[PDB]
């Protein structure tokens, strides 16, 4: 394959570090070696995260197209939209965000802290709710040229490129470390994060080692999205193989009870990981993927000796919209 053909606009500090999770690994049995690749610390643009890695491959097209406004969408505590707002500010672009009520969660400061708060400070036009088209049209009619960024950046032709690059990065780091990771655990919702990974790791025969953990609570849709995006992306980068259902692993046991709502396992997972490693995760995405990984290790689902690379996608600021749940820890 060949990713290098597509330009990448630097929005990150560079390759993201991989850290050992020795305390947590030991706590769980010392049988499985856990690591974490910090996508959550990839940028100076309002905390970045996985969405920011994706955006690097989309910005060039926005610039090439002479666009002046970035328009995106997501739930109230969307990480995607907060990142688009920061990238836009940094690029000197206007920003219009469509924020919808995507979660059955009632919290007094939900639309005023965390991710959405930053987007407003960053100068984005935050619209709280077809709304998609309206917003875009709004921009054209306003005299500007919008660059449409779908939810999570996922269902877009360039949306899968960022994480194919992730697999690339990991290969280079395994070469520096002198060892390979047996698996990768990643949280999945809109899909192009895992899709990129699947294509990237299909290259060296480990697509099936990319263990996705669903956090959408609609596993069938998410799995089809990932699969579809992986196929389109595999074509885009010249993978010399088709993606098979066997290449898309999506665990469904940890997404409940709903998207945006933690279960008690989620909370326990967030607490354990934070208290053993000092590494925070959130109740919507990462805490669920962290939950899955801990559970898998606990159930012995990982062969003894396995090295598991947890991909920390970001999302911590959303913790602010769930303050009551953590009031005592």
């Amino acid at each position: 394959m060949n990713l290098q053909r597509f330009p990448r606009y630097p929005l990150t500090f560079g390759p993201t570090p991989i850290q050992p999770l020795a305390r947590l690994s030991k706590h769980l049995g010392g049988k499985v070696h856990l690591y974490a690749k910090r996508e959550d610390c990839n940028s100076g643009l309002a905390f970045g995260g996985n969405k920011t890695r994706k955006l690097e491959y989309l910005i060039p097209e926005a610039l090439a197209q002479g666009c002046d406004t970035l328009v995106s969408i997501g739930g109230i505590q969307s990480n995607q939209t907060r990142q688009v707002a920061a990238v836009a500010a940094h690029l000197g672009m206007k920003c219009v965000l469509v924020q919808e009520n995507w979660v059955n969660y009632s919290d007094a400061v939900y639309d005023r802290v965390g991710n959405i708060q930053m987007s407003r400070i960053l100068g984005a036009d935050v619209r709280l709710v077809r709304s998609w088209e309206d917003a875009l049209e709004s921009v054209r009619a306003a005299g500007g040229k919008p660059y449409a960024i779908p939810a999570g950046c996922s269902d877009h032709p360039l949306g899968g490129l960022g994480f194919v690059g992730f697999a690339e990065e990991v290969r280079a780091q395994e070469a520096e470390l002198g060892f390979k990771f047996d698996y990768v655990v990643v949280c999945s919702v809109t899909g192009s994060t895992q899709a990129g990974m699947v294509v990237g790791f299909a290259a060296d025969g480990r697509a099936d080692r990319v263990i996705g953990v669903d956090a959408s609570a609609k596993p069938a849709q998410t799995r089809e999205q990932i699969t579809r995006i992986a196929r389109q992306t595999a074509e885009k980068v010249g993978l010399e193989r088709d993606i098979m259902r066997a290449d898309v692993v999506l665990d469904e046991r940890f997404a409940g009870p709903e998207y945006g709502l933690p279960n008690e396992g989620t909370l326990e997972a967030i607490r354990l990981c934070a208290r053993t490693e000092g590494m925070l995760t959130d109740p919507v995405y990462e805490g669920k993927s962290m939950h899955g990984m801990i559970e898998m290790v606990r159930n012995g689902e990982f062969p003894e000796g396995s090295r598991v690379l947890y991909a920390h996608l970001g999302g911590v600021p959303a913790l602010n919209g769930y303050s009551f749940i953590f009031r005592d820890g």
Copy 2:
């Protein structure tokens, strides 16, 4: 000098990047070149920030002395205590935090979002003073069978609390080497003081101590200024500074600290917005927004020599934004 004599426990990713703030520089007239060194992105331990750089030089002693608990203190939205809680969890140590109402602010979720929320999740025993806390805290640890390592407010008034930022100057020299030039100034927010102190000592070396432009955020200029001065002299001695720190070496502008510690003024808010909107870089209403406000005003007043290169030290503090949600409800 020789900071190398003191061990440094790795708590950061490595040197912190310097980024140009061209959009903001141009916005202010394009006469002064603004940069930012990102201490606020130095670690994977609950966002880190300047305190985490300070802590790298304290943990070895704490470990050497066999302590099993880190004990610290600060206001409700203290960045310090949150970093202590994360560093403790990472090191396998317990943590006790004494949090006091240091600000005349009373937001509905002030004690449940941002920094303090993270400390609780990180497993610290977060103690809210009513409404000697410090001694009870330390003693409770002994009484329980542990050994506490005491970390004073901001890590500042501690024998080792000024080291972290001497190394910051060391870091900046090596980056200037690749940059092919030296920054004319450094802007840093100051409250407990060992951050600006370390910098004062670090830059005294190549005679730029008075180029480190401190911006007071304590709203108690005199005390803070005095503490920086003292911490500097002590640290200077600790590292072998072949020169002495003169009062003239400690620079602290007091025009941007109002109205009180922990409360922003309208300038602070505008500054936070201007910078976030021109660079995608956030600052808080208690600390960085005030030093950012200082720098912009300085540039605006033509107080920087045309052509000057100014290095803004972004110390962190962003999670505290969550405690001032009403002020930013519309931006």
Copy 3:
């Protein structure tokens, strides 16, 4: 029957007013006439409400016993504990409230606004436990009673909602009495929200006396109808006997509709919300997402479905609870 036998301490202004809900009645077609008996406005003690009417019959006992502390229990936005705190302060008694989140809900300011905020201002010792403590399991209720004694005082034990208490059903028997006296100026049905039960129970006993027990249409807000229904019946029978009601309470006398309790105790459904908004926008009368909004939703839905004979006059008992709206601010952010 004779309630006059049991002493009643004044904690209310006097009988509660009945007002017509003419606008809401008209909006629903005008075929049924709705009114409201404002139990929610019965007292100067921190907004009072139904619980305060119940307390009038318990306090004489607490006083005769020489108790100096009132001890009660309830969820975070419990109306009962807030009224106990004000009654206590008013009487010069101390107050301990054992509390815990009894709802699968987690609003940012849930434990610091509305009802619980007032209890703390009122001087009560609000003992709110962290999630997973489980007071009902550890029997924290008793330790609290014990700690008062252990401390030198004498506690008067007031159970959840005052209901499952010997004198807990008297207040609302008196309500039926008061209604009769006001009718001497008759309502066909009464709509009342039911959770812990002695409110509707007292009504059942009180109205059984003039043959209207089955005219009290209870609307479950517990989302545990079977338990609640049984509680109402039992409290009724005990209270009937207590007030010498020369009659047995039939299973037929206790009416508890289960259609508007969803999805859970303390959680409103879209129906609850529309009902709160409709009643508020037509009569200027506010109801809450936990209790009254569900019974308001009940009455409106019943009238809408024609379960009420044309021409019927329905007396909606507004038991109170409005302060709890403060804990559901996000839901009403745009109205």
Copy 4:
């Protein structure tokens, strides 16, 4: 005088009750007998309060004029705008409310709980920010006829009538009681509440017995508004005398530090009163007037044996916007 010349629209349950504050009185030495007149429990329309007594005299005119929309104004936690929204709903009229932040305060849920929450639920169109004028115009432009209701109902020709009636009510109740109150404590900010009282008690020679307690923190301006409204109202009811400045008593010692902000004395008084009587007061209005009365009795400013009638004007729902302050009581 002749108050009866004006039509009063019923919006209350009827005369408000007078309760003794026996415990608070004994607590402060029992040398002064304190009582409370509960204007705060005067209506089933969203808790009511003094504003509702004022409004009973303005509504007939709004109706007579055929207006279909009530338009008013106040700060975020304004009690007035909440009562206006409830009266509108009850009357079947539309409601437009201009809310501005009149307080240097910024609590996270300030514009979502208490009074303003009720107004939105009651169906008012709550517009947060020439303010006033724009609102009024927009209603006409929509094809409606708005009835303008100034802040607190105070600078309105009819705004002072409600409390002239309050004095009426009190003489009548004093008859039944068989005794007279020597003083009346009342919180004053916009002014027509105390002005109505001044006029109503001028009739029996007790105008200077109406002890006003400033809560505006701008006493000179408030003292002048009460004076003016009182004179204009006395003329409108045919008082057989002109109102003199000496008829207006306004203590300025308890308004600090600013309108909308409590001082430590305010909080203490709110707590003492709540804990001795079970009667709540707020940090903006009543707690300051409660603070005043207690301080007056404590300093021996009332003659031994005096009977003081505290007018509790309402305002308790605003407590919700000061939750941090009362988190532990």
